[PDB]
Design a protein around this ligand. Structure first.
Ligand SMILES: COc1cc2c(cc1OC)-c1c/c(=N\c3c(C)cc(C)cc3C)n(C)c(=O)n1CC2
Ligand SMILES: COc1cc2c(cc1OC)-c1c/c(=N\c3c(C)cc(C)cc3C)n(C)c(=O)n1CC2
Ligand SMILES: [Mg+2]
Ligand SMILES: [Mg+2]
Ligand SMILES: [Mn+2]
Ligand SMILES: [Mn+2]
Lengths: 369, 363
C-alpha cells in the first residue's frame, strides 16, 4: 500500500540543471525532459535540493527517507492533466523559494532574530539588500514551502465554479466554499497522516506541529482566486493605512506568506516569453477540456473556455491587467520584490517580464481587430 | 433502499400538544413522551405542522410525501446522544419559527408568508415574516432542522485536538457545522424521493442552498462575537436595519438561528434545567474520552469535579446575555405592550441568571 521513494532516492545526473535553480526563469520543462515525462520525480527531487539549500533538514532533524517518501507519494497523487500537475507544483515551490531567499533592495533585517535559515546562494554581505528568510522564522518558511508542494494535490482539471455548478461530490462536501483548496489541503494532510513512513516532521513538538499545520492550511486556502481581491486589499491596507509590515507580528508574517504563495501560484505571465507561453498552452488546454464537458452537459460554456471562440489574447491581457498586475504592484509597494539597485532606482526582472508579456498580448489584440 | 416516511404521514394522536406550538415554553418533552422516546418522528411531525401553519407547502408547490421522506431520513440521522439529538433540532426549529412569526411590538411590517396564529388587526405589532421573503424564511427553517445532523456529541476543539477524520477533512475550520450542512445536503441529493424543492427554479434553488449553508455555519460558537459585533454595528449605524437589503436580512436570519440554537437559558426553569442535564451529560462523556487519552479534561467537563453553576452563569453572561441584548436592542424580540413592553424571553433569561448567581453565592 505505501508509496515509497525509489531506491536511487536523490538522482545524480541532474546536477547541471539543478545548479540553475537560483534563477527566476528556471528551465523547468528542460528538467521534465531530463528526468522523463511522467517519471513522477520532479517535485521530490527539487524539494530535496531546496530543503538542502536552506539547511532545513538540519534545522528540524528531518529524516531524509521519510521526507522523500511523503514527497513522492504527494507527487504521484498529482494527476496527469495539462496544467495542475506536479510540474506546476514544482514551479510554485521554486517561486516561493526564489521570492523568500533572493536579494531584496533596501529590505531591513528584523531586530532581535536568533530562529532563521538562509540559502547557500545568499553569500552577499550587503546592508543595501535583505531577504524574506531573514525576517520570517524557519518554521513559517518551511510551512510556506510544504504548502506550495501540497497546494494543488489531486486537482481534477476543473475550476471551483464548475464543481459548484454541477453539484460535484466535492462541492457538496465543502458546501461550495474553496472546494478544491480545501480538498488539496485535506487530502495532502490525510496522505501525510496515513503512514509513519511519511512522518518527516517527527521532531517538531506537539505545539510546533499544530502551528505548522495551521500555517500550511492558511497558505493553501489563500490560493482560491475567488478571494484574490480581498487579500490584495488587506495587504494594501497594512502598507497604506498601517505602519507597514511588522516583521515582529505573526499575522503580518502570515499575510506576507499568503501574498507570496499567491504570486508564486500565478507567476507564469511574469516569466520570460518562452516559459509563459508553455504555461499558457497548459492552462488553456484545461479550460477547453472543461468547455467540452460544459457543452455536453447543456451548461453555457464559461468565458475563454470555448475552443471554437478562444479569445486567447483577451484572456491573457485581462488576466494580467485585473489579477497579476495589481498583485505584483501590491507586492512591489511593500518593497518585497527581488531586484537590483541601478548604478535610487531599482531594476526589477519580475515586473519587467510582466510588462513585456502584457505588451506582447496587446499587440495580438490590435492585429486581430 | 431509501428511508421513507411512515405511510400515515401525519400522526393524529399529538393534537393536544401541537396546538401549543405558538407558546415560547412549548412542552417539547411532553411531546417526546406522547410520540415515544426513540420513535424518531418528532422532527418530521413538527416540521409538517409549522410548514402547514405558514402555507409554505402552497407557496412553493412542495409535495408533502417528498418533504416527509427527507425530514424523516434527516431525523433518523440525528444520533441518540443526550443533547445534540433530533429533539434539540426540533427545539431550534420551533424557536426560529416563534421568533419570526410572533408579534413584535412596534416593528414596521412590509412574496411573503404569515402564520395562521398571527392576527393582522393589531397595527402596534409586526413580525419578521412580514419583512423577510418566504424563500429566505423557508431557508432558515430548513437550516434549523439540518443544523446539527449526525452530531457525534463532541465539540470542534475535541475533534481538532485528536486529529479526528472530520477535523482533517475540513482543515480544522467549523468542522461539525461544515459536516452537518454537507451531510444533510448529500442526504437530500441522494434520492429523488427526497426532492421536496422540485418546483424552485435553478436560480431560486441555488440561492436557497447558499442561505441554508450560511445559516448552519453561523451556529459555530467560535464566530459568536463576530456576529454580535457585526449586528450591533448595523443597528447602531445610520439608517439601521435595511429590510430591502439582502445582506441585512441574512444577518437577521443568522442572529435568529443563533438565538434559537442556545435558547435554553431563556426558557422557563423547567425546560432550561432539562436541557442543562442534556448538555452537561455530553460534556462529561467527552471528559471521559479525554481522560481515556492523555488529554487534560476540558473546563466544566469533569464529572468528578463539576462547576455546574459557574458553567451556567458564565455561559449566560458571556454568550447568551450579549446575544439577547443585541437582538432586543434592534427591537426584534417578541413581547407585549403593557409605553412599556413585557418581554417573556429576556424575563426568563434574567430569572435563570439570578438563580445560578444565588447558587454560586451559597457556596
Ligand atoms: C498562469 O496562467 C493562468 C493561470 C490560471 C488562470 C489563468 C491563467 O492565465 C490566463 C485562471 C483564471 C481563472 N479565472 C479567470 C479567467 C478565466 C479570466 C480572467 C480574466 C480572470 C480569471 C480569475 N480561473 C478560475 C482559474 O482557475 N485559473 C487557473 C490559474
Ligand atoms: C443551551 O445550553 C448550552 C448549550 C451549549 C453550550 C453550553 C450551554 O450551557 C451550559 C456550549 C458551550 C461551549 N463552550 C463554552 C463553555 C463550555 C463555557 C462558556 C462560559 C462559554 C462557552 C462558549 N461549547 C464549546 C459548546 O459546544 N457548547 C454546546 C452548546
Ligand atoms: Mg489551485
Ligand atoms: Mg451545532
Ligand atoms: Mn496552483
Ligand atoms: Mn444546535
Amino acid at each position: 500500500k505505501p508509496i515509497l521513494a525509489p531506491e536511487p532516492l536523490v538522482m545524480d545526473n541532474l546536477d547541471s540543471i539543478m545548479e540553475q535553480l537560483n534563477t527566476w526563469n528556471f528551465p523547468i520543462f528542460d528538467l521534465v525532459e531530463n528526468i522523463g515525462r511522467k517519471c513522477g520525480r520532479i517535485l521530490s527531487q527539487v524539494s530535496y535540493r531546496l530543503f538542502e539549500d536552506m539547511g532545513l533538514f538540519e534545522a528540524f532533524k528531518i529524516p531524509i527517507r521519510e521526507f522523500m517518501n511523503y514527497f513522492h507519494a504527494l507527487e504521484i497523487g498529482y494527476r496527469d492533466i495539462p496544467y495542475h500537475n506536479r510540474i506546476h507544483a514544482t514551479d510554485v515551490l521554486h517561486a516561493v523559494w526564489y521570492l523568500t531567499t533572493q536579494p531584496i533592495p533596501g529590505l531591513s533585517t528584523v531586530i532581535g532574530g536568533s530562529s532563521y535559515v538562509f540559502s547557500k546562494t545568499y553569500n552577499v554581505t550587503d546592508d543595501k539588500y535583505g531577504c524574506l528568510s531573514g525576517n520570517i522564522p524557519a518554521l513559517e518558511l518551511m510551512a510556506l514551502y510544504v504548502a506550495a508542494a501540497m497546494h494543488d494535490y489531486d486537482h481534477p482539471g476543473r475550476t471551483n465554479a464548475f464543481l459548484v455548478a454541477t453539484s460535484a461530490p466535492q462541492a457538496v462536501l465543502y458546501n461550495d466554499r474553496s472546494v478544491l483548496e480545501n480538498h488539496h489541503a485535506a487530502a495532502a494532510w490525510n496522505l501525510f497522516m496515513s503512514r509513519p513512513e511519511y512522518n518527516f516532521l517527527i521532531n517538531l513538538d506537539h505545539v510546533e506541529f499544530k502551528h505548522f499545520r495551521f500555517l500550511v492550511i492558511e497558505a493553501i486556502l489563500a490560493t482560491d482566486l475567488k478571494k484574490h481581491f480581498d487579500f490584495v486589499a488587506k495587504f494594501n491596507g497594512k502598507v497604506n493605512d498601517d505602519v507597514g509590515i511588522d516583521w515582529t507580528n505573526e499575522n503580518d508574517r502570515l499575510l506576507v506568506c499568503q501574498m507570496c504563495i499567491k504570486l508564486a501560484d500565478i507567476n507564469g505571465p511574469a516569466k520570460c516569453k518562452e516559459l509563459h507561453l508553455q504555461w499558457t498552452d497548459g492552462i488553456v488546454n484545461e479550460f477547453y477540456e472543461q468547455g467540452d464537458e460544459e457543452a455536453s452537459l447543456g451548461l453555457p460554456i464559461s468565458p475563454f473556455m470555448d475552443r471554437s471562440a478562444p479569445q486567447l489574447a483577451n484572456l491573457q491581457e485581462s488576466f494580467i491587467s485585473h489579477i497579476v498586475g495589481p498583485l505584483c504592484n501590491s507586492y512591489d509597494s511593500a518593497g518585497l520584490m527581488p531586484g537590483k539597485w541601478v548604478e535610487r532606482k531599482i531594476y526589477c526582472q519580475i515586473t519587467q517580464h510582466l510588462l513585456q508579456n502584457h505588451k506582447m498580448w496587446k499587440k495580438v489584440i490590435e492585429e486581430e481587430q
